[PDB]
RNA sequence: GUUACUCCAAAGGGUGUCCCUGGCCUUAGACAGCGG
RNA sequence: AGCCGAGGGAACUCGGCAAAUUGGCCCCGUAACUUCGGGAGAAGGGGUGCCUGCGGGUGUGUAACCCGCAGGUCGCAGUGAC
RNA sequence: CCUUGUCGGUUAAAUGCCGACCUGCAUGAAUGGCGUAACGAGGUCCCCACUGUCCCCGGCUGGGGCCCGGCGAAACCUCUGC
RNA sequence: CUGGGGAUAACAGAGUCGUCUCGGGCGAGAGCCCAUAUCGACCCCGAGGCUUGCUACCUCGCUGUCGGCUCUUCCCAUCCUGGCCCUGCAGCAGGGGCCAAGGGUGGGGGUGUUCACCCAUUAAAGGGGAACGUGAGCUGGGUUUAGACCGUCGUGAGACAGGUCGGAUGCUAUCUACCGGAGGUGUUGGCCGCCUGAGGGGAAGGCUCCCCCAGUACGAGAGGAACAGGGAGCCGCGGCCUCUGGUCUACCGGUUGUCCUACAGGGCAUAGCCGGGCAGCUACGCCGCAGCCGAUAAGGCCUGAAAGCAUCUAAGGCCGAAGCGGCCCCCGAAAACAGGCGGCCACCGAGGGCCCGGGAAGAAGACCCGGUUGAUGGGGCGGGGAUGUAAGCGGGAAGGGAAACCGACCCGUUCAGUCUGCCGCUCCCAACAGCCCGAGUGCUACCGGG
């Protein structure tokens, strides 16, 4: 016998197309600060910076190359408030209140919207919900939100999402939500520079692929390459059990999967396509434009490293759920060079 | 510190790319009797099914002497890789490469056999092995 | 963050890019791209190429 | 254990618990303490 | 059924299977051994394009074929593909 | 036959190859014996060069495979089929 | 060669276990002395069926093949990794045992080999089972079919559970099984969107070195630790194209032979060959992968009887593992209690699909974006890029020539010309015109108000 580990992981099975192209968030982190626990935007491109290392380790204090991805984040519109109670097995939705004045283009997503629903009815429903929350029947409060991709000329159809709120007191959460409903939210009001983030998106599509690429199996000997079995696996299994096992590697869908990636550092939050250094303001859009994208005009995040997804795709961001003890400090790091040169 | 007076080993921040597998020939850059060695092992390396051990600048290899004065021919020696042709990255992003693949013959503990190295060596090797940078004129 | 100069074409290239070739005698060369590296080693002469600075200097030499 | 048979692992050990017996002690015995 | 592949260079495999390398002409130079006929194109090394001019052989010939020299010049590469 | 005999050389490492030794289970002189230049799509060991054989697999080109319109079979088949 | 045979061998299975492997009881004794730290005779009792044999129940045109490559899974009878106990355990180490199978267990040389032997590394380089796993998956080196040589036996034809050279590897998947992709029905009216999260899967992580603790404890010396704390890497897993490399039969240029009369511009010769090469794809490039909380195993303790003392146990309590469960990640309303919520229509018609311009998605289906309330494709004008300075005109050129002139090639005009599977602006052309599907009924038992 020669021993070796198996080919690929069983932890992401079945390897199927994602249910939706908007990613869902399954778990939320514990944050004492009463704030909205994430944000959403659109991927634009990659570049690199040079900066003085702030993370623990050696190379602390040294200038280092660091790669960066840029996410365009226009402001979100808070259109609703939703309440959750405790069910027999788990949480159950009790009641939602929607705001009355909505943008035209929201009907491209929600085809059947209320008709009369005046400000007065809105205030009455909010009063109903306030009394419900004061009674003691409620276990959680969440915000209902939608994107505005008409401010950057990308689309007219919005993405509709539900986000959670930090802290413990349900009443304090509800007061936050009552402040925020009917108003725009900007990423600076939620995120802190130097924080660690988790990032969630659907991966690039590749279609049907075979097991050399999908599972990392070995190419067969050159005799088999001349016999017609080079990029096949050898056998589907033993005589008994007299069936193919699900654990045996086979061909199928590769890519377009739901994935979460831990502990990416936010390095800078920008404004109207510009970043402030010590004295000057510099455009992060590179000469000629970001490829397969154009010109960043609104507001953006720098996230160091790489993130899942194609360029023009919806990305969701939350604060880190599984961070280490030795963290970097929550301040913007000292940056010395930003690449603005052509990327084509 | 137990024994810091004179130490043989150091610490680099870079970690170059492993570019030279078992079977590679190496020109000997120091003034020992050896001229050409062949790699038979890479010190401190564990692999997997059908993978060969490989080394880069700064790594200690086990080698056999192929050409050289008769006392050294057919001997199994330790050596430090000091020059390589494949590019590797520095902290600022720039790639560095050299013109040949070259090693210097040492003791397991790290002490150089020989008195001078002919030509340029790499800063990564001079940093991991402190006593080589003293017997080498040019260091990058 | 300082800008290095190319040994073949004489233009400046940005930080985090390019190459340093080291000869055994110690002479160091800097290249902005694979194009320039490959041309320098196969032996093309930059004093006849109008997209280099050596061309301007040799025109001054005419 | 819930197996008539077809189709159920010992030499050697445990007084773990329920019982039948036979000898030496027992108005002070087997220890438990103060002392010679 | 075909083309390319960084750094290594047979670590693959029963076995260098298959693929790669070399390649035309001129000059130089050529081991052991030998039935003295060969081995031998042994091995190994240099050169080769275009344009401008000079010369030779046969020939009655600024007809036709063949053989040398010098200079200038371009390219990563001149039996540049076959 | 014991057998990967023993000694030496070739390798970092030799159930191989070459050279020697001789208890030749069971060599031997026209069922020819011992040698041998040249020759061999014969069998076998090594060196130089070369390479996607391999480390470790990647990208391209044409033809099929796939969808559409038309022509249109066969091997096999107790009934069935976790 | 024919006819037959599992009435009868080779092989996988089935049976059995002399033999084998793995154990145990007693105690001859060996161990300065001391039975049991370690080693344990002779006799006696067993487990397993992975070693070989015995038997002949199944199979004579099921497949008859050994070894290697590839791929999945299981056991523990544990080599390393986590935790403990005794020692003839000072330390560093050794020896012998208990819990524990979550992870690891590799690369080479000769030989067809499994095995065994050897080399350099290594934390260690454990072994077994699955038709001695796996030929409707590959290979075909071995396994003496037909050809041939040597030795030996035989009058001979010939033979050898002897050696040597050579010697055909077929298949359009009927059913089930698995990997992935679609269409229906149901869920007691139909439709849009957001959620819950029963249950299933996970190794998503595993391991080594270095510094410090410390030349310290320990120790006659020589040697030589540990808890905590700081750094780096190897193997495994999941993603991305800024940087670096490869390809790039889009593109730009150079050049050979020949044909279109030369010029200019083109066709063929593998894209003719050579050099460069953006987007895209890719690794030889780069980014990320928590240690806490509970309950336990061996084991360590408390209280405490039976048995006035004593005792970890009989009833009760506290601790205590890389192992179990949860947090975390992936799939997930067909979860038959077949769900919750907000809104729309209904009791002509909300809503959907085809069609049209497209691509970030894609074998068909599906997904996504847009459709004049418009920058979706194209054009035009600009930007960013790739290659490398076009044609024409002018001026020179080694030399030749009575001379007008010939001349490969050089310089100027000229960061030029050609191109753009990238960006921006602008309605100049086209996203026109339409065609299909689509829920209406009640009985009785009702439910809360009429
Ligand atoms: Zn340059």
DSSP string, A169-220: -HHHHHHHHHHHTTSEE-GGGT--TT-EEEEEEEPPEEEEE-HHHHT-PPPP
Left (φ > 0), alpha (ψ -120 to 50) or beta: where does A298 sit? alpha
Partners of A131 in the β-ladder:
none
Give CA–CA dist B104/B79, Å, rounded.
5
Residue A318 CB neighbours (<10 A) = 21
Partners of A64 in the β-ladder:
A51
B85 touches chain C (CB under 8 A): no
Q: Do B119 and C24 touch (CB under 8 A)?
A: yes
Give CA–CA dist A134/A121, Å, rounded.
20
Residue A326 CB neighbours (<10 A) = 8
Which one of B11, B50, B91 has the shortest CB-CB distance to A63? B91
How many Å separate Cα A160 from the centre of its chain? 14
The resolution of the experimental structure, rounded to one decimal in Å, is 2.5
3-state secondary structure of A10: coil
Residue A25 CB neighbours (<10 A) = 18
Backbone CA torsion sign across A167, A171, A176, A180: positive
* H helix runs in A78-136, sequence order: 119-135
Give CA–CA dist A170/A139, Å, rounded.
7
Partners of A141 in the β-ladder:
A83
- Protein CA at A260 to nucleotide C1' at G193, angstroms: 24
Subunits close to C (at least 3 CB pairs below 8 A): A, B
Tokens of A236: 């589907």
What is the CA(C11)–ligand 1 centre distance, in A? Answer: 6
First to last CA, chain C: 38
Question: Which nucleotide is at minimal CA–C1' distance from B100?
Answer: E7
Residue C14 in marked binding region: no
How many Å separate Cα B65 from the centre of its chain? 15
3-state secondary structure of A225: helix
Question: Which nucleotide is at minimal CA–C1' distance from B66?
Answer: F12
Which residues, other chains included, contact B28 with Cβ-Cβ below 8 Å and sequence gap of 6+? B34, B35, B36, B37, B68, B79, B102, B103, B104, B105
Backbone CA torsion sign across A255, A258, A264, A270: positive
Experiment used for this model: cryo-EM
Q: What are phi and psi of A132, to 5 degrees?
A: -55, -45
Please state whether beta strands A63-72 and A76-86 pair in parallel, antiparallel, or not at all (unpaired). Answer: unpaired
Which residues, other chains included, contact A124 with Cβ-Cβ below 8 Å and sequence gap of 6+? none
What is the CA(B139)–ligand 1 centre distance, in A? Answer: 25
Q: What is the DSSP string of B106-128?
A: E-TTS-BSSS-EEEEE-HHHHHH
Give CA–CA dist C35/C42, Å, rounded.
11
- Protein CA at B35 to nucleotide C1' at D16, angstroms: 82
Query: Exposed/middle/buried for B20, CB within 10 Å: 0-12, 13-18, 19+?
Result: buried
First to last CA, chain A: 51
CB B106 within 8 A of CB B100: no
Residue keyed to tokens 């990032």: A199
Question: Which nucleotide is at minimal CA–C1' distance from B65?
Answer: F12
Tokens of C3: 């800008």
Q: Give the residue before each break in chain A, using a C-to-N cut-off of over 2.5 angstroms; say none if it is continuous.
A: none
Nearest CA-CA distance, residue C62 and chain B, Å: 36
Q: Do B93 and C15 touch (CB under 8 A)?
A: yes
Q: Which nucleotides of strand F are protein-proximal, with an atom < 7 A from a CB?
A: 11-13, 53-58
Which residues, other chains included, contact B118 with Cβ-Cβ below 8 Å and sequence gap of 6+? B29, B30, B31
Please state whether beta strands A76-86 and A274-276 pair in parallel, antiparallel, or not at all (unpaired). Answer: unpaired
CB B85 within 8 A of CB B129: no
Helices H / strands E in chain C, number of each: 2, 4
Q: What is the DSSP string of B59-97?
A: -EEEEEEEEE-TTTTT-EEEEEEEE-SS-EE-TTS-EEE
Please state whether beta strands C19-22 and B95-97 pair in parallel, antiparallel, or not at all (unpaired). Answer: parallel
Give CA–CA dist C25/B140, Å, rounded.
12
Residue C9 in marked binding region: yes
Q: What are phi and psi of C19, to 5 degrees?
A: -145, 155
Give CA–CA dist A199/A201, Å, rounded.
7
């Amino acid at each position: 016998k020669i021993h070796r580990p198996r080919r690929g992981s069983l932890a992401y099975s079945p390897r199927k197309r994602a249910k939706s192209i908007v990613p869902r968030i399954r778990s939320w982190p514990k944050d004492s600060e009463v704030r909205m626990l994430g944000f959403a935007g659109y991927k634009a491109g990659m570049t690199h910076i040079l900066m003085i290392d702030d993370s623990p380790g050696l190379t602390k204090g040294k200038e280092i190359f660091v790669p960066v991805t840029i996410v365009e984040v226009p402001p979100l519109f808070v259109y609703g408030i939703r309440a959750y109670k405790q069910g027999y097995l788990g949480l159950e939705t009790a009641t939602e209140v929607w705001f009355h004045d909505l943008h035209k283009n929201v009907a491209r997503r929600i085809k059947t919207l209320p008709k009369n629903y005046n400000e007065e009815a809105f205030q009455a429903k909010l009063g109903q919900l306030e009394d419900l929350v004061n009674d003691g029947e409620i276990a959680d409060v969440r915000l209902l939100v939608h994107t505005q991709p008409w401010l950057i000329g990308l689309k007219k159809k919005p993405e509709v999402m539900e986000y959670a709120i930090g802290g413990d007191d349900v009443k304090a959460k509800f007061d936050y939500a009552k402040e925020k409903i009917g108003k725009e939210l900007r990423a600076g009001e939620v995120l802190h520079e130097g924080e660690l983030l988790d990032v969630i998106a659907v991966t690039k599509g590749k279609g049907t692929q075979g097991p050399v690429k999908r599972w990392g199996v070995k190419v067969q000997f050159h005799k088999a390459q001349r016999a017609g079995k080079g990029r096949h696996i050898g056998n589907l299994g033993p005589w008994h059990p007299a069936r193919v096992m699900w654990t045996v590697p086979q061909a199928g869908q590769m890519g377009f999967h739901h994935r979460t990636e831990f502990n990416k550092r936010l390095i800078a939050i920008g404004e109207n396509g510009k970043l402030v250094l010590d004295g000057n303001e510099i455009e992060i859009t590179p000469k000629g434009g970001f490829p397969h994208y154009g010109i960043v005009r609104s507001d953006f995040l720098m996230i160091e490293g790489t993130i899942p997804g194609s360029f023009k795709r919806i990305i969701r961001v939350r604060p880190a759920i599984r961070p280490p003890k030795k963290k970097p400090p929550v301040e913007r790091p000292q940056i010395t060079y930003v690449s603005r040169e052509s990327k084509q | 510190a137990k024994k810091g007076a004179g130490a043989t080993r150091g610490i680099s921040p870079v970690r170059p790319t492993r570019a030279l597998p078992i079977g590679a020939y190496l020109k000997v850059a120091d003034n020992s009797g050896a001229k050409v060695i062949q790699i038979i092992g890479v010190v401190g390396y564990k692999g997997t099914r059908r993978r060969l051990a490989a080394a880069g600048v700064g790594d200690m290899v086990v080698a056999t002497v192929k050409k050289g004065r008769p006392d050294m021919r057919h001997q199994v020696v330790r050596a430090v890789v000091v020059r390589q042709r494949k590019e590797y990255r520095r902290l600022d992003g720039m790639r560095v490469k050299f013109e040949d693949n070259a090693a210097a013959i040492v003791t397991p503990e790290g002490v150089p056999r020989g008195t001078e190295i002919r030509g340029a060596i790499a800063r990564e090797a001079a940093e991991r092995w402190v006593r080589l940078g003293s017997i080498a004129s040019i260091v990058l | 963050a300082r800008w290095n100069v190319c040994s073949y074409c004489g233009r400046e290239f940005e930080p985090g890019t390019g190459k340093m070739f080291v000869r055994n005698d110690g002479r160091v060369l800097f290249f902005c791209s694979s194009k320039c590296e490959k041309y320098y080693f196969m032996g093309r002469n930059p004093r006849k190429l109008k997209w280099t600075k050596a061309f301007q200097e040799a025109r001054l030499q005419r």
